[PDB]
Design a protein around this ligand. Structure first.
Ligand SMILES: [Ca+2]
Ligand SMILES: [Ca+2]
Ligand SMILES: [Ca+2]
Ligand SMILES: [Ca+2]
Ligand SMILES: [Ca+2]
Ligand SMILES: [Ca+2]
Ligand SMILES: [Ca+2]
Ligand SMILES: [Ca+2]
Ligand SMILES: [Ca+2]
Ligand SMILES: [Ca+2]
Ligand SMILES: [Ca+2]
Ligand SMILES: [Ca+2]
Ligand SMILES: [Zn+2]
Ligand SMILES: [Zn+2]
Lengths: 222, 222
């Protein structure tokens, strides 16, 4: 029942179900305005991806691309397998008070189900050729899914410069579970105005959760 | 009803009351074993304490010293007023898998009630002269409180070297509320074997919560 607008919208999520309690009481929620940063001696994140995108789903909240097993990242010496990537517009995270027009999330899970998410900002620019492959077959209605003709490598959607912001946060959609590793790439990717418009049109509106207070947290920068 | 031992002990806190739900579902709980650390460009914490300790209370869980208003620290540009300090044995936090025999917690709150705690480790060594003033009048039973003859300055219980570990965590006793700034001093203070035994004898046993998983967190070091 949750949505991005109106009476079931983000400010009310925590009243929708008992299972959604973190929305109401969480102190380590995402997304955030990346505005309290410290330089830190972070390790580079090992990204071991293979071409594995298989399906594209419109779930009514985003366009979500499933990934087949075998691609992973390493964070804190632990392997987190890539499950899926999906999109938001405008950006969920803000960077010193400002939005980007689009943000991608690459969702990973370790063997115990702990999650790590890589966030990539997209600005308005040149047409993105990888996205175009997805956009071409993007389902227009909630609940529809389509198989991709050819497997896409999610690594092509990540910047080559891999410096990043890191913090401890949450899922940005209910149940907004905490304990999530957030890795937000410092370098922005690019897509066309037309691509952004198409995504927004299909979604029917904004698909970002409002930024949540950092509270005690600091954001570490590599 | 909560305790450090038995059927109402730390593994069961989250089943005692609905208000203690964080103790069950929290992913940002304290204390922790400080074993995932990264160098960070953190600023010194500004410590503006005045001699202000007025009373000593045995609440059955610890010995807590109240502080009169006017003493504060600055974290993230925000003023957190020192409310009280209290003690645990053995240490709540561990440092690379090892306990210290004793730990002090200096509890601060900002105008909106957000909390910041400074933790200080104590090793067995020389008698601590400031703790001797408190220990001399320490109440032996739960529910007893005594006024100090002379006001103590809590600053004398902090190390002169002010490098620290920082992370986002929780209260270490129910309701174990999150959103707490933890500042754990890297340099240990000292007290006598007899000071440690006397505290432990009055408390009647261990007064530490077990270390909780780091989950998505890193500990930053100044
Ligand atoms: Ca810098
Ligand atoms: Ca950089
Ligand atoms: Ca760069
Ligand atoms: Ca740039
Ligand atoms: Ca770029
Ligand atoms: Ca920077
Ligand atoms: Ca170092
Ligand atoms: Ca030193
Ligand atoms: Ca040092
Ligand atoms: Ca030392
Ligand atoms: Ca020392
Ligand atoms: Ca060190
Ligand atoms: Zn997302
Ligand atoms: Zn404490």
């Amino acid at each position: 029942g949750w949505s991005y607008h109106g009476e079931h919208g983000p400010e009310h999520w925590g009243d929708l179900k008992d299972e959604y309690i973190m929305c109401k009481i969480g102190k380590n929620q995402s997304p955030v305005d990346i505005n309290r940063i410290v330089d830190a001696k972070l390790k580079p994140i090992k990204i071991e991806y293979r071409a594995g995108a298989t399906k594209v789903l419109n779930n009514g909240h985003t366009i979500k691309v499933s990934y087949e097993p075998g691609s992973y990242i390493v964070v804190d010496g632990i392997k987190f397998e890539l499950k899926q990537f999906h999109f938001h517009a405008p950006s969920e995270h803000k960077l010193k008070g400002q939005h980007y027009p689009f943000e991608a999330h690459f969702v990973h899970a370790d063997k115990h189900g702990n999650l790590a998410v890589i966030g990539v900002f997209f600005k308005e620019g040149r047409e993105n050729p990888i996205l175009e492959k997805i956009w071409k077959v993007m389902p227009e209605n909630a609940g529809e899914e389509v198989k991709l003709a050819h497997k896409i490598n999610a690594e092509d959607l990540l910047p080559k410069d891999r410096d990043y912001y890191r913090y401890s946060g949450s899922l940005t959609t209910p149940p907004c579970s905490e304990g999530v590793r957030w890795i937000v790439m410092e370098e922005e990717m690019e897509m066309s105005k037309e691509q952004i418009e198409k995504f927004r049109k299909i979604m029917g509106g904004d698909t970002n959760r409002p930024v949540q207070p950092l509270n005690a947290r600091m954001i570490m920068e590599k």
